[PDB]
Amino acid sequence: ADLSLARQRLTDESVNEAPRAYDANMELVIVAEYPEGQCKSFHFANPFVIKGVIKSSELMWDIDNGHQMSEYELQRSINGYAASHSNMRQRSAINRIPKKLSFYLRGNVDWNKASIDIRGPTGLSMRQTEEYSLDRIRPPCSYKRNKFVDLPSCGGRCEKAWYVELDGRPVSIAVIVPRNMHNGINLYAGPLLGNVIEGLDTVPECTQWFDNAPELYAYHASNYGMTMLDQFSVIH
Amino acid sequence: ADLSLARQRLTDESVNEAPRAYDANMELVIVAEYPEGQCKSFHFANPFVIKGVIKSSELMWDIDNGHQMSEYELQRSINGYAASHSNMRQRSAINRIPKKLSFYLRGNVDWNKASIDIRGPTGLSMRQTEEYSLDRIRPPCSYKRNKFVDLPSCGGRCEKAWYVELDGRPVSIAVIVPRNMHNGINLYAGPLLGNVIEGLDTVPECTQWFDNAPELYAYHASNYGMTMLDQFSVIH
Amino acid sequence: ADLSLARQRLTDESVNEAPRAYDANMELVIVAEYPEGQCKSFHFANPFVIKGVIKSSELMWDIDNGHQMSEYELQRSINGYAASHSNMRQRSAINRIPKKLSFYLRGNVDWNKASIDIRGPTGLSMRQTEEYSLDRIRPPCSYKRNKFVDLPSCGGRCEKAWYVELDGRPVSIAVIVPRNMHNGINLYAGPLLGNVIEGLDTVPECTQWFDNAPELYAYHASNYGMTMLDQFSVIH
Ligand SMILES: Nc1ncnc2c1ncn2[C@@H]1O[C@H](COP(=O)(O)OP(=O)(O)OP(=O)(O)O)[C@@H](O)[C@H]1O
Ligand SMILES: Nc1ncnc2c1ncn2[C@@H]1O[C@H](COP(=O)(O)OP(=O)(O)OP(=O)(O)O)[C@@H](O)[C@H]1O
Ligand SMILES: Nc1ncnc2c1ncn2[C@@H]1O[C@H](COP(=O)(O)OP(=O)(O)OP(=O)(O)O)[C@@H](O)[C@H]1O
Ligand SMILES: [Mg+2]
Numbered sequence A, B, C: 001a002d003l004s005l006a007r008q009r010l011t012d013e014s015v016n017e018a019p020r021a022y023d024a025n026m027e028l029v030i031v032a033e034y035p036e037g038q039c040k041s042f043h044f045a046n047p048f049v050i051k052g053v054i055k056s057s058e059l060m061w062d063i064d065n066g067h068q069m070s071e072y073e074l075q076r077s078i079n080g081y082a083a084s085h086s087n088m089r090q091r092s093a094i095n096r097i098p099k100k101l102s103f104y105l106r107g108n109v110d111w112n113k114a115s116i117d118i119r120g121p122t123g124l125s126m127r128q129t130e131e132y133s134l135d136r137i138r139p140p141c142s143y144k145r146n147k148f149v150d151l152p153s154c155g156g157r158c159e160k161a162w163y164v165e166l167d168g169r170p171v172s173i174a175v176i177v178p179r180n181m182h183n184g185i186n187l188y189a190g191p192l193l194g195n196v197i198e199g200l201d202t203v204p205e206c207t208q209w210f211d212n213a214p215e216l217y218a219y220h221a222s223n224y225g226m227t228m229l230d231q232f233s234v235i236h
């Protein structure tokens, strides 16, 4: 045989396999969820290396009575966590700090080398005592490998996620997602290199705000085909 | 031959040929024009690869009664074009969407490989049904080659432009402008590579707002030497 | 041996030498000081190439009666310095332009090649008559080499600084800080290249505002271990 079914099947496979192509994007969606259930999503994409870099001021829930707060006000609040008695706050800012972070990765990702680094409030490597002397990238713990959680990608065989609960303190984020080259070919070798470098960092980012998770599911996840997992382990 | 004239000629040539030098910038000016005639300009530069990346929230006319609107408010408006009934708008946002985009390129550009990609409202490859599975960079159509329009560069032999009319829907932009290496030398080959990589992405961007095109012509184009074309095909 | 002292010594050396490691960050802190003594600090870090890029609108003191000014308002003020009579200002904006810029560099820096380029108000190479034709990066004068000033790093042997007085005109900034490879090994050569490229531009930036220098010293410099020099040549 039936060629209407053969045509459906070819159509399916073309969609399912497309992300494996040269110059096809890997996709990263980071979702921050806050205590009253609001969500902020950050989308990054690239074919070669996704660099998902988020400042601590960017990860705060930044809406106050319908208006967006400035980086100045947000950083002022963050400062008191970084340096003792460096602002004038008499109470904490936990209302605006994420309770949970979800990382959704979809595409031809090198799962051995994808790294998620949760860094300090001013961008330093996280530790008890943050200091410029002991500041580095890609610590051993940031490589999640088989600690990624598999999720349905509806034929693509290519979505996983990672989840983390925060502890009431602002953080910043550095995610590095390299392309799978386990087919034995180094795309950085030879004259192709220039074409790869030209393609790095060329896709616009997008930040979205949602008052609750169901809005996120209805108008992001299911609009574009990223499967997401809720607190009841039900997929959307 | 007369050495006052010889000196003038050397002076002319030094200015005209300067952009061909190693570490000389290529120049990109993107101009958005809106329905009441206001203009927003975005300037990018690099010697090796210009990466002109603009979010859809950045391309909206964002001035409201003398004050700049927040990304939150702008994205809220954009959302309704991306996902059906995802905001509370009862009317469209066409007042703030560009009618026209102009791309001005000046310098030692590889015109075979310069690419202009008009992408969807959340940064995905543009198509009838946008979806994460079918998201890529540098589609075949983005390479304009002889569809660039030549304009005077006053001796430089090195300015072209590209124009597009939008259709009432928000878009995002990815422009990739590589350097002309048709003199036979690969600047990415050998020990020079590190010096090239150090130079990528090192020039500050600049965004400017104008209430009308003549302001743009008087205080940008003719101030710095980018020739621009108006709706009467007259140059400025 | 006395092994309590041997343990102290090993602990010291581990902290002092850490920045020499592969994937350890170089650190850059730029401090702008304004006429009433307020300070803005900008922090950048990377192990391979720090790219410290600051727009002129970002370098303005942008607080007005407790609220942060928009890029639109700030750029409007800057415009009049770039293009004659392009805004409606009847007085200058010198209250909000830095009097002084300090550049603090800490780590395994190639001091032969670190470059600090003070560029024009719209990002062009600085000169009497700024023009797109004569726009380039890494001019010979931007390499400071032995014009860097040595400062204590408390055992690291690895901090220097550079200072400049401005002249009442807005500027933009491009700082390029490459890693020291004088141990004879090219980290861009061979299969390591891909791992280097993956690490570029992956550390979150941080901007902070202080009403006076002592706040900067107490809650940034001495919090994280960057030594700073005041107008009395006393270190903090
Ligand atoms: N509700 C759930 N909670 C947690 N994990 C789930 C859930 N549903 C499915 N998964 C996991 O997702 C993975 C992929 O599932 P499945 O093969 O059914 O999806 P699919 O639509 O074929 O997608 P793919 O092409 O990605 O395989 C499996 O490991 C499965 O256990
Ligand atoms: N008013 C116009 N509308 C459209 N195209 C124009 C207009 N004026 C000039 N051009 C085109 O610009 C190109 C360059 O023109 P011309 O040689 O006169 O400029 P020039 O000052 O010598 O600059 P260059 O050094 O870039 O050649 C030509 O293809 C010309 O047709
Ligand atoms: N108050 C000051 N003003 C200007 N320069 C200073 C001042 N104090 C120290 N320096 C300079 O800093 C440099 C390093 O000093 P010193 O060796 O005492 O510091 P250290 O704590 O051992 O740090 P390092 O490990 O970086 O050497 C010297 O060149 C010194 O002259
Ligand atoms: Mg399956």
Ligand SMILES: [Mg+2]
Binding pocket: B155, B157
């Ligand atoms: Mg000509």
Ligand SMILES: [Mg+2]
Binding pocket: C155, C157
């Ligand atoms: Mg010493």
